[PDB]
Write a protein that binds this ligand. Sequence first.
Ligand SMILES: *[C@@H](C[C@H](O)CCC(=O)O)C(=O)O
Ligand SMILES: *[C@@H](C[C@H](O)CCC(=O)O)C(=O)O
Lengths: 296, 296
Amino acid sequence: MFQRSIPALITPFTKDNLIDEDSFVDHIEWQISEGSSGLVPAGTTGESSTLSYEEHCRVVELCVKTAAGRVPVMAGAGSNNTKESIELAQYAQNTGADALLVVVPYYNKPNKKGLLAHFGSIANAVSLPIYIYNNPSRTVIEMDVDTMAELVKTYSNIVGVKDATGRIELASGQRIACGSDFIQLSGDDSSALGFNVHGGVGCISVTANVAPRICAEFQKAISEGDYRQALEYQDKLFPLHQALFIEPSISSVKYALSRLGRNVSLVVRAPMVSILEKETMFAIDQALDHIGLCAG
Amino acid sequence: MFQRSIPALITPFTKDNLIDEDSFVDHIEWQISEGSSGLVPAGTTGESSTLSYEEHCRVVELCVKTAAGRVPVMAGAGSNNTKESIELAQYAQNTGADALLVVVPYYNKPNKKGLLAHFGSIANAVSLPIYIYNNPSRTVIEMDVDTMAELVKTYSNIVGVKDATGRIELASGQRIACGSDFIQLSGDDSSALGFNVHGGVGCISVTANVAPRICAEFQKAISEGDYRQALEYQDKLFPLHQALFIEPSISSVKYALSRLGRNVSLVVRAPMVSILEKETMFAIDQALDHIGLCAG
Ligand SMILES: *[C@@H](C[C@H](O)CCC(=O)O)C(=O)O
Ligand SMILES: *[C@@H](C[C@H](O)CCC(=O)O)C(=O)O
């Protein structure tokens, strides 16, 4: 269901700090027309953390309605509060999402028994497919492979992972422990290539917000097994992947989209700030121009 | 104003998962009469992550009303959403708290400019004193000494830190950069002793929930400079400090309280669980015995 290039969508805001619904719709429609294969609304890159419950819901609802069944929609539905996670998950299901992205809880550092309680309680509350989002560089704790295997064996609707560790040995470990039917998606743009040759089938990408066509061509070459050509795309994209997290990628992505002429404002919600260092903007600009993304 | 032993109060829950207000009030009265010098409601040990906005406000208000001026109340106003922190801080001010505890944002990983925006925005929205809560073992990012010193120099109501790093060389660096009027409180029970000799004046403690009297006598000895007696207290408290975070401390503390006979249920909110391993319960029990606290 989910494969190849899947953007973790930004959430654009207006000058008055409302959800820029028009810009969000245009972004989705542009992403699809450029070759993105699925959508993740209200994830990390979507500034989930600074959305109200009702904004989060509205963002998922809007993304589902815009996609119009052309590509699958994996709703962000995870916080570090299980009850709230269940509420976001059931909303996503009732509004028509195709699947759920559920992060390992951040900040309160549950132990393994808590992870089993968290994901198990969510899996029992919806019938949608659930993707475990493992990102220790933000959550500190890391779900280990025994726990992930245990969840897959226990809950039929826990069906894959987003693996943002960037340590691709874990892709081999997860493939062996959870089965080759377990759907592995990279959560780290810069190692997405090797992740797939170890068994991944796509990437939930930051960079695809900014460069969806070549990210899509990149993932298409991999799925055709043209790895020589995938390596040529990697050398072109890698400087951009890197330039976009010199500072928080949410700021950097909106900076780049606005530079490219997309109708996306620079506004972000605190504690993100839109002001970038000049060295950062210069790195992003050079990487964009090396790919040749400026129309004019 | 804030000094010696200050418990990060647990939030007790009923069997039906409501806030157990009578238990919370009783815990506060007990804490005060056993010699705790301040209270921090709705911090990390308070399970702030799993309180609704309303319940968080209720915990703070109920703590303020119970304390009734006897000891100062430093309300938890932390989240990784700046707008929400402002609302929590303004609720705390309007309900009568004496100060605010504000964690460095977790999960979304702001950079230095984001920290200045986050803490600056909060300092502009309230007139209460603010304590920076630095805990990179949960937030990943760590506020550095230059950023702290700049906040302190810029905003008159940024007055202190909770320094939960447990690297006490930072207490020296923060003392020199921010000045000796800067109020430094340890956020790490096991190194509170050395933290104070480097310039700290108290501890926001997990263990004080369980053994408020001994922790109070421990901090009293330090403030009188009887460091020989303080080391004697450290040797008796250290096994309890360590036993309480074998597994998550919020579960471990509530288990310890019930083994002491207090009216605190074991209920915690997912993704925390109350089940502890046999070895964890035994390590806590023996640590409690070693302080004669229960057996002798
Ligand atoms: C997933 C896409 C990326 O994994 C974000 C990675 C990061 O840590 O910045 C998402 O939910 O954004
Ligand atoms: C502050 C007290 C401690 O630093 C908690 C220690 C931990 O990281 O668990 C608080 O807000 O609980």
